[PDB]
């Protein structure tokens, strides 16, 4: 009698995805994880893993699972990888060099794009320095590039750090919005709880 099957339905396909600059992090724990359905699903455009091969994900057993979700431009999915330099990787979501886990993404043009242009998705263009891996920035202080104390009074050479995505159906595949979910596994000095469903 297998019990406590871990849902994943409230995480993989919800009705509201967060912006990339405020990526939502939901802890997964005390779960009987089943990644077979995720692998056998044919709706994911990209599903490739580091450290752990997708075939045997049901065997190794982990203490905790962290899932992060956000929505990014179609072409910018290549920047979500260890040791990659880009714009969103350097300013929004930075991955460690020795990252363990993988990312799952699929096209979401049928929901995240509007005829008049969906303007509810943001991505940061400016900040002082590159952020260390696994960090979230939310403050909206104006990135100054002029001499004076900007004081946040929007104008010339006090540039707004945050700009919006113009998601519209008429653009190409490289510009279509994509929903990205990254699963991160770790091991630490604690008993392992979140792992596969065995078999019988």
């Amino acid at each position: 009698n297998i019990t406590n099957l871990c849902p994943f339905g409230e995480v993989f396909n919800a009705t509201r995805f967060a912006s990339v600059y405020a990526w939502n992090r939901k802890r997964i724990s005390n779960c009987v994880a089943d990644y077979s359905v995720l692998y056998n699903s044919a709706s994911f455009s990209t599903f490739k893993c580091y450290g752990v091969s997708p075939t045997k994900l049901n065997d190794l057993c982990f203490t905790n699972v962290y899932a992060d979700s956000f929505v990014i431009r179609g072409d910018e999915v290549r920047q979500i990888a260890p040791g990659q330099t880009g714009k969103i990787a350097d300013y929004n979501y930075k991955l460690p060099d020795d990252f363990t886990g993988c990312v799952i993404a699929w096209n979401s043009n049928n929901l995240d794009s509007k005829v008049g242009g969906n303007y509810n998705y943001l991505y940061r263009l400016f900040r002082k320095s590159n952020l260390k891996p696994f960090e979230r920035d939310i403050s909206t202080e104006i990135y100054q590039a002029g001499s004076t104390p900007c004081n946040g009074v929007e104008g010339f050479n006090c540039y707004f750090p945050l700009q919006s995505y113009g998601f519209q159906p008429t653009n190409g595949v490289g510009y279509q919005p994509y929903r990205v979910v990254v699963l991160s596994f770790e091991l630490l000095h604690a008993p392992a709880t979140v792992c596969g469903p065995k078999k019988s």
Partner: antibody
Amino acid sequence: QSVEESGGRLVTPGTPLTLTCTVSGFSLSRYAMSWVRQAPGKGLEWIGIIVDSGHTAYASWAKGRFTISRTSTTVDLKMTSLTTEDTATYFCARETGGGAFYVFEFWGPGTVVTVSS
Amino acid sequence: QVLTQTPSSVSAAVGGTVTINCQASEDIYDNLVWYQQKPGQPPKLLIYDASTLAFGVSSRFRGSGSGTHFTLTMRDVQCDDAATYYCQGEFSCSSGDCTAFGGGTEVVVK
């Protein structure tokens, strides 16, 4: 996959004219057709595009005097209030595959629309 | 939103090579294509994504570049390459006007 169009005529300024581009050898509802034009001896210009779903986009320099309509096998375009600088050659272009817009790998033979008195 | 091609015209011998540069006013990732238009004929797609050769084209045409600077160079240009070339790339949407074409360059072989 063969794409052809016709409708070139000599018209006075301010008179509407219709060009119809007819598809052949594929399903229209899967690929996006677009219209481009070039003046005699000058560079290419972009006019507009219609995606497979039915949504349409245009060009700013056109200012919004064109209209692309879709149907079974007639990706037609209609203009209004033509000027004397619209004498050019028009093409209708097909795409490569699903998505990957603005590739324009199949082209029609080309038709010439001239405006004069 | 603005595409620029330099030089406008360039000539080389049959056993020679020439370069074509097409710069974009905005970051466009790698979404850029090239065309070849012989006089009186519809343009033919040569390279898409700025580094992938189209089907049925020769391997003496190569492309490169990413971001805002791109370059196309033909090696050992024959007498069949005498035509005009254009560069086209996407440019977001609302911000600008989807797609624009470059001014084009003319190539003549002696």
